[PDB]
Structure formats: structure tokens, C-alpha cells
Amino acid sequence: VEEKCALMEQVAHQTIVMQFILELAKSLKVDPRACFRQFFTKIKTADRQY
């Protein structure tokens, strides 16, 4: 309700990463808590297309 734009963007970021991690782990049948490194290396070097 408070319409916190930077907070809202970061909320979208955190929820999308957690949802993606959970679906990837479930289809992957691996514990999500041990599935962050490939995501970090993909998103840290996320270029203009990515």
C-alpha cells in the first residue's frame, strides 16, 4: 500500500529469485539452500540481453 518504489523493485527481485530457485530446485530435485552459485554467476554477469 505504501507504494515504496525502490523497496517494491527489491521486493519483486527477492520474490522472483526465491520463486525461481524453488521451481529450479523442485524440477531439479536438489535442496534450494545449496543451489545459489550458478544463479549468482548468471545474474552477476547479466548483460544487456540478460
Place this chain on the structure above:
Amino acid sequence: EKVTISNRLVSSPCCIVTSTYGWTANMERIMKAQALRDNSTMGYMMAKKHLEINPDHPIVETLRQKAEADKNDKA
């Protein structure tokens, strides 16, 4: 998964298509048919497929007019 009709065929009863997010035929084949494949998880993830029919080859028309008669046939 899905079956539809499109504009890609002139003389083939049916053809097959891949998803918008999915490796094509040759890509999937070459990827899986190479050593150190590591198929444990990545193998069981890709290659979604669909289907299409041309409504021009009379074989499909006779098939449809046969299927409209019997709904549980054998052949």
C-alpha cells in the same frame, strides 16, 4: 502436449515443432550424444514438442470422415 493447424506444409500429412523455449532436434541430439553428458539432471529438462496437420492431403480428410462415424474404433 498440444495439437493444432498452421501454414507450413504442402504435401506432408503431419510435421513436428518445438517450443519457444526449447532446444531443436539437432541441438538436443548433439547435446545428449556427446561424452561427459552429465545427463543426471539437465537431460530430464528439455525438448518439449507439439504437432501439426495439413488439412489438404486427402488422407486426413478420409481419416476424419472415418473417425466421425466410429468413436472407439481399432484401426
